[PDB]
Each structure stands twice: as structure tokens, then as C-alpha cells.
Amino acid sequence: LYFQEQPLRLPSPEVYRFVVKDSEENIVFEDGIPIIKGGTVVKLIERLTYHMYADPNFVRTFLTTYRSFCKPQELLSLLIERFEIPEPEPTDADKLAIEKGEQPISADLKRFRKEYVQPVQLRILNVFRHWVEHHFYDFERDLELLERLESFISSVRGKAMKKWVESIAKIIRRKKQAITFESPPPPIEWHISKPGQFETFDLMTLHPIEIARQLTLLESDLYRKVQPSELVGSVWTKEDKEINSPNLLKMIRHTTNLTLWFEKCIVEAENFEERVAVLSRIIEILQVFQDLNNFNGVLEIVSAVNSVSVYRLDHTFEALQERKRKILDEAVELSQDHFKKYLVKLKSINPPCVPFFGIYLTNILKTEEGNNDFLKKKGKDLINFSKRRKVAEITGEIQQYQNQPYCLRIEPDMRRFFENLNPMGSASEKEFTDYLFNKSLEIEPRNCKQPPRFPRKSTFSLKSPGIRPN
Ligand SMILES: CN1CCN(c2nc(Nc3ccc(O)cc3)nc3ccccc23)CC1
């Protein structure tokens, strides 16, 4: 700062890549730790494990996003390469002193070992620790990766790192090995279907309160299991999506299936009074979703009534009681103007909640599309790290809602029912979409002044038990 100190004496870049001189051709920063904009993967690794200071924000963001520019096996190889630092060639005077015997090592070599080698090696062990702690799925998905890591840390010498090595081992041990209520949850609610009778379960025979509760528990669990890296690089939309984004895909597919199931229930209710009762029941379920701050569920139902097969059923909507219509329309309004009213509601509510997941997916897709993976250079193009940082900012928002358990008891049969929903049957999504629309045209034909009469299908009461608990 106010005086330049003597430089460290480093090995040559020909024997150790990471000490190649910084330039705009291999590392770039944004405009007290400098913020990395991009670099070669070698320079990114160097800064990930920099000798001058720790960089926890970079370590976290790097480990969340690196799979978009570097393979897991490749990262391990780079970190091992970083670790195995060669010492500079002894100078002629150094060689004299060594041969003379019982002389201290050179001042330059002492500085190098203390100020460069030991800090870098400890930073590498720190990265390993965060990697297995927060991203152990990399090692679950790739057995050779874990075996390589374990083999490497067994090879490390010196008491200075045994604490670190054993700490990494301990985390790996705990990972390899792998409900209470503070206050009593409310009693499970039952309507026509009774405990154990899972063969009779259906939208109108289950209790609307309990449908909403069990779906909220399910959706909360799905949401909680999504890892940020499943979103980075839009990997859930690419070739290896089933391996890279399993929890995200489960969540998306649940939402698709549940929305289609609500639509199916409505349009397959050919009897007019029955159909009005089905839509009314779905609005009651929406109310309880709302009460539970499950906005994922609220917007699944909004999506269902916006669908082209349902939205066109004007006679059905007109027959809704005014209070339920108002409730439905206030929810639909949450989504209007790019989810403006939803977004203000999200920022105000208290946990537990289940956020609408769609808005994160949309924003991530835009960000991935709207930023280049590389910074263009005359030589090798640089990895655009600032792009990854922007994505990680979005995934960080998802995480803030993932540790909020509901005070609701699971109903195992109802849970299985909702996990196993298959509205499409054997149909393709396209086939099923056409099926819904043609059924819609059948039950309320174009330009029909009154919906034709279809016979009632079930014999049970259409009367709802309501959404007040007992
Ligand atoms: C032209 N259609 C459009 C679809 N549709 C909906 N109506 C209402 N509200 C309403 C208010 C006053 C009324 O007298 C009757 C209905 N809300 C909806 C929410 C979502 C999806 C469709 C509708 C029926 C009318």
C-alpha cells in the first residue's frame, strides 16, 4: 500500500501453471476483495485457493455454479494439481549452504513455504470440506470421484493438515451413513372417504382441508429438496437433465400433473351441477392453500382455470356463488402484471410457506439466455463468471424458504394418492390436451345458451364439508 515488499520467489509456470502472470488475457475483474468477472479455469482455481486471503463468497458461488464450466472430475484434478506445488530451483548459494550442512534453509524458501505453499494447501482443503458438505451429490453420482478424493487426502503428509484431512473424512463418514412437533398438529380431516379406504379417494370424496394440507406437505418436501446447481446452466432442459436435476424435475412434473388433474376433474364432470360443485371445491382447496401460504398450490389452481379447456366454460363460472367467485378472482389477480401482487404478498408473509416456483425458472432462463458463457478474447476465451454469479443470486432466493416445516401431520394413503396422480393415463401430453379441449366442447358447445343435460355420475352429496376445521 505505502511500501512495496519483496516479491515471493515462485516456481516457474512451466512446472506449475497457476503462477502464470495475471493479465487481461487470463483473468478479469469487475469495477475489499476484488470481484472476479471471468478467467481461464486455471485462474479461477488459483483465486478459489488464493494465497493472500480467504474468499468465502467466491468459494460458495463457485461450488454452486462450476458444473456449468468445469466437470466434477476436472475440478478434482485441478485442485490436486494446485496442491502439489513444486519448490523453486535452489540457487547456487542455496546449494552451497545445503551441502555445507546444518544451515537454515534460504530466507526465500522459508517465505515461500510459509506464505504461499501452506496457505494455498489449506485453502484447497477448505474447498474440499465445503464441496463434500454442501454438494455431496457430486460424489453420490460418481463413485470414482469420491474414491479419488479419499485416496488423495490419505496421501497428505504433515500434522499441520491432519486436523483438516480428518475433518473432511468425518464429513464423508456422516454423509455416507445417511418428525417432531413443538405443538400438536391439528387432527386429520375426513369427508366421505374414510381412513384406509384409499381405493375410494377422489377430489370430491376427500376432505378439501386435508387435500390442501397433504398437497402442501408434498409440495413443501419437493421444494425443500431442490439444489441450486440443478438450476444453473439450464441443465434441467438439457440432455442429462435426469441426472443433473432430479429434484427440480420432480417438482416441475408434480406441478404439471396436479394442474392437469384439476383440469381433468372439471371437464370430466359432464353433469352441470356436479361440475359447478367440483370447481367450487377446487376454490375451497385454493382458500386453504392461501391460508397455509402455499402459493405454489394457489397458482397451480389459477393455472388450471386459465387453461384453454377450462377458461372457456362460461356457464360453469357464472353459476359459482359470488363469494367463491370473488375468492378465485383475487387469486387470479396475484398473477397479473408479471405476478406483481404475488411478489408483494411473498415479501410480507411469515413462514412456513411454499413459494411459486415458476418465477425463478423464468428468471433463470432469461439470465442464461441473456448472457454469454464466455468472454471473447484473441486467444482462449475466458469463462464468464459474472454470469454464474447472477444465476447464483436467483438460486439464493429459492434457498431462503427451504427450512420451514409445516405443523401438519402426514396422511400416508393420501400422500401416496397425490404422489401417484396420473391424469394423462396412456396419452401423450398433446393427446391429453386435445382430449380435454374436445371434452370441454362436448359439455359446453360453442354458442350454446344453456349447457346441455348430462346424467349425474356419482350418488354422493355434492355438498362440501367446508373449510372450517373441527
Ligand atoms: C368470459 N369468461 C372468462 C372465464 N371466466 C372467468 N370468470 C371469472 N369471474 C367471473 C366474474 C363475474 C361473473 O359474472 C362470472 C365470472 N373468473 C375467472 C377466473 C379464472 C378463469 C376464468 C374466469 C368466465 C367468463
Side-chain angles (χ1 to χ4, degrees), residues 279 283 301-307 310-320 322 324-326 328-333 336:
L279 182 56
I283 294 171
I301 285 170
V302 172
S303 182
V305 296
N306 280 351
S307 72
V310 174
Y311 187 83
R312 63 171 301 281
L313 298 173
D314 291 346
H315 296 289
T316 302
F317 284 93
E318 186 57 35
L320 290 176
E322 188 177 352
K324 290 211 176 62
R325 207 154 57 206
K326 277 180 162 180
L328 179 56
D329 284 344
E330 179 156 32
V332 169
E333 278 156 20
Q336 283 162 9

Side-chain angles (χ1 to χ4, degrees), residues 188-248:
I188 312 301
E189 299 274 351
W190 299 95
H191 178 40
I192 296 168
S193 283
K194 294 310 184 183
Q197 312 174 337
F198 64 82
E199 305 83 5
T200 73
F201 288 3
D202 203 3
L203 173 73
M204 294 292 278
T205 56
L206 289 166
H207 198 297
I209 296 175
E210 206 57 51
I211 290 173
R213 286 174 180 172
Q214 293 306 313
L215 278 169
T216 293
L217 287 172
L218 176 49
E219 291 176 1
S220 172
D221 280 344
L222 294 172
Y223 180 91
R224 174 182 53 81
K225 289 174 179 164
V226 177
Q227 303 305 306
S229 65
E230 306 188 45
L231 294 133
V232 176
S234 304
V235 278
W236 80 92
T237 70
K238 293 184 176 178
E239 191 169 89
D240 290 340
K241 61 172 85 68
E242 305 292 339
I243 287 296
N244 292 327
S245 308
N247 304 289
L248 178 52

Side-chain angles (χ1 to χ4, degrees), residues 290-450:
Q290 277 263 29
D291 297 339
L292 291 171
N293 293 334
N294 179 359
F295 291 100
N296 191 77
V298 170
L299 279 315
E300 283 164 335
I301 285 170
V302 172
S303 182
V305 296
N306 280 351
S307 72
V308 293
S309 65
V310 174
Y311 187 83
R312 63 171 301 281
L313 298 173
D314 291 346
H315 296 289
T316 302
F317 284 93
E318 186 57 35
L320 290 176
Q321 82 177 17
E322 188 177 352
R323 179 172 144 65
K324 290 211 176 62
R325 207 154 57 206
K326 277 180 162 180
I327 285 167
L328 179 56
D329 284 344
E330 179 156 32
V332 169
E333 278 156 20
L334 289 174
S335 63
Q336 283 162 9
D337 308 317
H338 302 308
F339 294 88
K340 185 184 170 70
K341 283 171 176 176
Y342 163 66
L343 286 177
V344 314
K345 199 168 183 192
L346 179 62
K347 86 167 93 298
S348 69
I349 38 77
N350 302 312
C353 74
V354 187
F356 171 58
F357 208 83
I359 192 168
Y360 304 120
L361 297 170
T362 298
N363 296 348
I364 289 170
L365 285 169
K366 293 181 181 172
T367 304
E368 291 284 341
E369 296 284 297
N371 294 275
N372 205 277
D373 279 345
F374 294 95
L375 310 174
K376 313 160 204 183
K377 295 289 163 169
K378 178 186 167 64
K380 165 78 93 36
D381 289 345
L382 306 187
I383 295 161
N384 179 4
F385 192 77
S386 285
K387 175 184 182 174
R388 274 67 176 198
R389 181 177 299 110
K390 295 182 189 170
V391 171
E393 307 279 15
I394 303 167
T395 59
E397 296 185 282
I398 298 173
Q399 289 186 294
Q400 69 174 289
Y401 301 104
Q402 284 180 324
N403 342 282
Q404 305 169 8
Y406 279 84
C407 190
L408 299 167
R409 190 178 304 279
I410 291 180
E411 209 302 315
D413 287 331
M414 292 183 63
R415 176 62 156 254
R416 282 183 280 274
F417 177 79
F418 288 115
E419 284 170 344
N420 298 335
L421 276 188
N422 184 44
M424 287 179 263
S426 285
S428 67
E429 183 147 339
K430 172 80 216 126
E431 285 170 333
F432 189 67
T433 299
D434 294 345
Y435 164 77
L436 293 171
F437 198 82
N438 289 315
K439 183 56 80 176
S440 181
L441 288 174
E442 175 181 5
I443 60 183
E444 294 191 20
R446 288 191 52 247
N447 302 138
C448 229
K449 292 187 173 179
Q450 282 175 347

